[PDB]
Amino acid sequence: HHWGYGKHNGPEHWHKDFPIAKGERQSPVDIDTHTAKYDPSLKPLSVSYDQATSLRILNNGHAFNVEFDDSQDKAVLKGGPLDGTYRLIQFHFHWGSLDGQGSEHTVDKKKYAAELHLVHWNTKYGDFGKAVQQPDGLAVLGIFLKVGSAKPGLQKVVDVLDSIKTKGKSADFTNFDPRGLLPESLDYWTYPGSLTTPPLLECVTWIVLKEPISVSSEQVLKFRKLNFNGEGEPEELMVDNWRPAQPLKNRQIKASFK
Ligand SMILES: O=C1NC(=S)S[C@@H]1Cc1ccccc1
Numbered sequence: 001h002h003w004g005y006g007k008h009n010g011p012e013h014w015h016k017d018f019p020i021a022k023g024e025r026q027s028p029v030d031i032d033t034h035t036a037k038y039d040p041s042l043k044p045l046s047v048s049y050d051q052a053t054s055l056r057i058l059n060n061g062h063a064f065n066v067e068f069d070d071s072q073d074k075a076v077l078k079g080g081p082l083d084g085t086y087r088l089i090q091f092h093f094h095w096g097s098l099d100g101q102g103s104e105h106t107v108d109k110k111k112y113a114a115e116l117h118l119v120h121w122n123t124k125y126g127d128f129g130k131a132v133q134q135p136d137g138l139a140v141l142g143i144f145l146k147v148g149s150a151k152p153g154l155q156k157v158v159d160v161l162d163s164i165k166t167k168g169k170s171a172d173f174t175n176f177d178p179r180g181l182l183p184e185s186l187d188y189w190t191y192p193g194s195l196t197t198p199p200l201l202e203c204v205t206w207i208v209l210k211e212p213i214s215v216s217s218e219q220v221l222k223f224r225k226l227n228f229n230g231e232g233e234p235e236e237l238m239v240d241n242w243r244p245a246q247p248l249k250n251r252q253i254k255a256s257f258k
Pocket residue numbers: 063092117119140194195196197198199
């Protein structure tokens with residue numbers, strides 16, 4: 001497959017190789033704050049990242065992934081809408097060419113500068129590959145980024161990007177603490193959806209935090225110096241690596257907060 005974010009291979013083309021692109025539970029979506037319902041049934045959300053073990057950072061030609069050791073329950077997400085234990089496998093971002101675009105989810109049609117996805121898999125399915133084949137296989141914690149003050153807990157990520165400029169490059173990335181990327185409040189919206197890139201599998205419980213984090217203009221500018229291309233290929237800046245909002249269809253978005 002040769003999917004990407006350009007005119008010729010972007011989101012509007014994905015459905016040809018991945019017909020589930022036009023499915024019933026695709027992500028991202030617009031979160032209409034005046035339609036989303038407070039759900040008193042939601043249990044408290046539990047982000048347990050104390051023992052997280054980051055390993056490596058990889059430019060895969062679509063984004064960069066910070067990868068974690070998920071061979072044990074070291075960094076897990078529980079509670080909220082979730083039954084059981086979901087293990088952190090990786091995080092990555094989607095961002096824009098300009099500060100007015102970049103997020104995948106939107107809030108009352110507002111686009112943020114970027115969006116962080118912390119990807120977790122349900123440990124009752126044993127491995128990530130099995131989990132993506134299940135409707136409750138993954139839990140993705142989504143966090144919006146706006147441009148303002150610098151995020152100190154992001155700077156270690158920003159400073160390694162020079163070493164993974166092009167597709168296929170990776171770097172050792174140990175001892176990174178993903179707690180430094182969270183906002184103060186864990187208030188969230190939740191709905192059932194999908195992976196936001198091919199293969200677009202409808203296996204995700206989305207948990208989208210209400211409170212954005214602030215990052216500096218200089219931090220997001222460094223994301224925009226990454227490349228989609230491989231080393232020694234013509235430069236194509238890694239920007240606007242976001243899928244637009246998809247039809248909500250039969251779904252309800254629930255709020256954790258009044
Ligand atoms: O960019 C993304 N955001 C998501 S949420 S799923 C996709 C990454 C991904 C994760 C797992 C398998 C394939 C692709």
